[PDB]
């Protein structure tokens, strides 16, 4: 008969988020955080309150 067991381990999931490292590119990670904004809205706008002088 088998005896009891305890295991130490770590989280896995279905994430395909990927980060780069000096030694290895495209390493797949459980969790990640984008810090680059690549999107804008294509318009000229009022700034804090104030409409710009658009000549």
């Amino acid at each position: 008969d088998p005896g009891d067991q305890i295991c130490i381990g770590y989280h896995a999931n279905n994430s395909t988020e990927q980060v780069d490292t000096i030694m290895e590119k495209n390493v797949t990670v459980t969790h990640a955080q984008d810090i680059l904004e690549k999107k804008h809205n294509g318009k000229l706008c009022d700034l804090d309150g104030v409409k710009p002088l658009i000549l």
Partner: nanobody
Amino acid sequence: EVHLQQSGPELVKPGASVKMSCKTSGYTFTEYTIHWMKQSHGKSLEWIGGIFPNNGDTTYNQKFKVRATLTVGRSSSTAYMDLRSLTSEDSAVYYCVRNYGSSYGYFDVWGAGTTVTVSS
């Protein structure tokens, strides 16, 4: 300079509909948003809605959402408002007005005033 010429006073049977017009002049139509103000005769001012010419985007007051319909003739450089199924309530004065910049803007140029009377 910046003149907003609007429709002449009208009379409408209760339950019917009106279409008052506002003709813009003195600036470039598509650079400022146009709005309409209702003033119950010598009382207090109410905001109806606003429209941006260049793409035809509308922004309404909760109260007027159903009864009103702002339209723009870019070709004609003219702004329109349309009031559906009127009552004695709607008998008041209506102003076509240019709001300066966006959601957080001031009304700098106020139109003449189309004054509507609702009676059988």
